[PDB]
Amino acid sequence: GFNCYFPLQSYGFQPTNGVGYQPYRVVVLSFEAPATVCGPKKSTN
Amino acid sequence: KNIDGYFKIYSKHTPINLVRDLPQGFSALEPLVDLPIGINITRFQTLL
Amino acid sequence: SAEIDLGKGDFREIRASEDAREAAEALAEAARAMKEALEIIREIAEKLRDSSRASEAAKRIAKAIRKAADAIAEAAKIAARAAKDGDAARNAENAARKAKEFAEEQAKLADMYAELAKNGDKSSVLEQLKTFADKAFHEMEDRFYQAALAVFEAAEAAAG
Ligand SMILES: *[C@@H]1O[C@H](CO)[C@@H](O)[C@H](O)[C@H]1NC(C)=O
C-alpha cells in the first residue's frame, strides 16, 4: 500500500447493500462492405 | 469471385467419362451461396 | 419511521427494547457519525483543492475517521448485552472489531497522510490524498454499510 495501489477494486455485493450499490446488468449494442444485420421486415396478407 | 464484398460461389457437378481432357461439353454453373465477407482475395490455394 | 438517509435510503427510529433505543442514540454516535463522515469526505473526495487545506482537512478527517473508528465499535457494543439473541449479534462485535480496525487502520494512516499533507508538497502528495481518500471513502462507506446494518442487526437481536 502506502503510495502503492493495486489497479483493482472490489465491489462488495451483499444482500443488504444500497440499491445504488447492488449489482446491475447493462447491455450496450453498437451500430456500424455488405450490411447483413437487418431488422425484421413484416410481411402482409 | 469477390465483388462488392460479396464473394459469390458458383458450382456444377457433371459425371466424367473422359480420361485427362477437359471435356468438350457445355453446362451453366449456378449460384451456391453469396458470402458477404469483406476480404481482399488475390491468392488462393486448394486443399487435398 | 425517522428521516435518516442511510444506504438505499432506508430510514428508521429503531422500534425495540429501549436499549436498542439506547443502541439508537449511542449508535447515533455512529449513525449520525457515519452519515456525517460520508459527507465531509464527500467534500474531500474531489473538492480537495488546497495543499494548505489538505494539512488539517485530512487531520479533521483523520480525527473523524478516528472518531468513526471508535464510534462504530461503540455502536456495535451495547446491543450485544441487551441482545436476547446470539446469532444476529455476531456481526456487530465483528464490526466492533472489523469496522473499528478498518477505520482505525486508515485513521492512523490518514494521519500519516495528513502529515504528508501537513508539509504539503503539492507536486505529488495531493495525488496521494486523492487516491486514498476515495479509497477510504469507498472503503469507509463499504465498511460503514457492512456495520450500518450489522449494528442494527444487533439492535434487531436486541429487540425482545
Ligand atoms: C484490402 O486491403 C486494403 C489495404 O489498403 C484495406 O484497406 C481494405 O480494407 C481491404 N479490403 C478487404 C475487403 O479486406
Swiss-Prot record, chain A:
Superkingdom: Viruses
Consequence recorded when altering residue 9 to N: Reduced host ACE2-binding affinity in vitro
Effect of residue 9 to Y: Reduced host ACE2-binding affinity in vitro
Result when mutating residue 17 to T: Reduced host ACE2-binding affinity in vitro
Function: Attaches the virion to the cell membrane by interacting with host receptor, initiating the infection. The major receptor is host ACE2. When S2/S2' has been cleaved, binding to the receptor triggers direct fusion at the cell membrane. When S2/S2' has not been cleaved, binding to the receptor results in internalization of the virus by endocytosis using host TFRC and GRM2 and leading to fusion of the virion membrane with the host endosomal membrane. Alternatively, may use NRP1/NRP2 and integrin as entry receptors.
Subunit organization: Binds to host ACE2. RBD also interacts with the N-linked glycan on 'Asn-90' of ACE2. Cleavage of S generates a polybasic C-terminal sequence on S1 that binds to host Neuropilin-1 (NRP1) and Neuropilin-2 (NRP2) receptors. Interacts with host integrin alpha-5/beta-1 (ITGA5:ITGB1) and with ACE2 in complex with integrin alpha-5/beta-1 (ITGA5:ITGB1). May interact via cytoplasmic c-terminus with M protein. May interact (via N-terminus) with host bilirubin and biliverdin, thereby preventing antibody binding to the SARS-CoV-2 spike NTD via an allosteric mechanism.
Protein's name in the database: Spike protein S1
Lineage: Viruses, Riboviria, Orthornavirae, Pisuviricota, Pisoniviricetes
Span covered, complete protein: 485 to 532 of 1273
UniProtKB/Swiss-Prot annotation, chain B:
Superkingdom of the organism of origin: Viruses
Glycosylation sites: 40
Variant or mutagenesis effect after changing residue 19 to E: In strain: Omicron/XBB.1.5, Omicron/EG.5.1
Effect listed in the UniProt record for changing residue 40 to Q: Increased resistance to neutralizing antibodies
Self-association and partners: Binds to host ACE2. RBD also interacts with the N-linked glycan on 'Asn-90' of ACE2. Cleavage of S generates a polybasic C-terminal sequence on S1 that binds to host Neuropilin-1 (NRP1) and Neuropilin-2 (NRP2) receptors. Interacts with host integrin alpha-5/beta-1 (ITGA5:ITGB1) and with ACE2 in complex with integrin alpha-5/beta-1 (ITGA5:ITGB1). May interact via cytoplasmic c-terminus with M protein. May interact (via N-terminus) with host bilirubin and biliverdin, thereby preventing antibody binding to the SARS-CoV-2 spike NTD via an allosteric mechanism.
Reported function: Attaches the virion to the cell membrane by interacting with host receptor, initiating the infection. The major receptor is host ACE2. When S2/S2' has been cleaved, binding to the receptor triggers direct fusion at the cell membrane. When S2/S2' has not been cleaved, binding to the receptor results in internalization of the virus by endocytosis using host TFRC and GRM2 and leading to fusion of the virion membrane with the host endosomal membrane. Alternatively, may use NRP1/NRP2 and integrin as entry receptors.
Descriptive protein name: Spike protein S1
Organism: Severe acute respiratory syndrome coronavirus 2
Highest classification ranks of the organism: Viruses, Riboviria, Orthornavirae, Pisuviricota, Pisoniviricetes
Residue numbers of the full-length protein present here: 195 to 242 of 1273
